[PDB]
Design a protein around this ligand. Structure first.
Ligand SMILES: [Zn+2]
Ligand SMILES: [Zn+2]
Ligand SMILES: [Zn+2]
Ligand SMILES: [Zn+2]
Length: 100
DNA sequence: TTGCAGTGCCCACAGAGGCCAGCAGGGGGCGCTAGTGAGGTGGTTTTTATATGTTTTGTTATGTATTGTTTATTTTCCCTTTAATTTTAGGATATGAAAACAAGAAT
């Protein structure tokens, strides 16, 4: 029912349309007090500051290294600890942690 | 000793193959982020629900009006007895009208 004007975005929640309009309008009100980089939400700026300094809270349960976000630890476990490999190739027997 | 037939040696430029940097092939692991997606919390209203006040409905009691009841004073229908009232002779009256007499008038 809900439709977009800038693109063919179709959702059922008005709040989803609101966020999509915020993405089109690029409301970035969160700057970094070290570099000119800016973001739209607080968690992005929090991770950016957790990269300018070493304050990595997501610790690896199987080794002693760490990362700022969860997805990086997910893929680290699928590379090094639980070799998942969901996506597989066409001809060869290849598979890896990322679609890239 | 020489000409001829056959050998020795020294060089050198090719020929060859290992040495080497350069460079491209497939694949493993990390740094970082935009953008949804979903889930949880807070606010809002809202909707159901509950309780109070007012009014409407139902019930009760009293007074008035209607129908009925045996008196009860008309009233009215029906007797036997008078009290006017009417009808029928019977005698008397009256008022008329001829009748006779008397008085003018004529012949
Ligand atoms: Zn759009
Ligand atoms: Zn910065
Ligand atoms: Zn690890
Ligand atoms: Zn393949």
């Amino acid at each position: 029912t809900f439709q977009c004007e800038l693109c063919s975005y179709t959702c059922p929640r008005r709040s989803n349309l609101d966020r999509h309009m915020k993405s089109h309008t690029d409301e970035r009100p969160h700057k970094c007090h070290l570099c000119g980089r800016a973001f739209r939400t607080v968690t992005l700026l929090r991770n950016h500051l957790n990269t300018h300094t070493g304050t990595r809270p997501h610790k690896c349960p199987d080794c002693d290294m760490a990362f700022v976000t969860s997805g990086e630890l997910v893929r680290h476990r699928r590379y090094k600890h639980t070799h998942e490999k969901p996506f597989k190739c066409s001809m060869c027997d290849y598979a890896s942690v990322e679609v890239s």
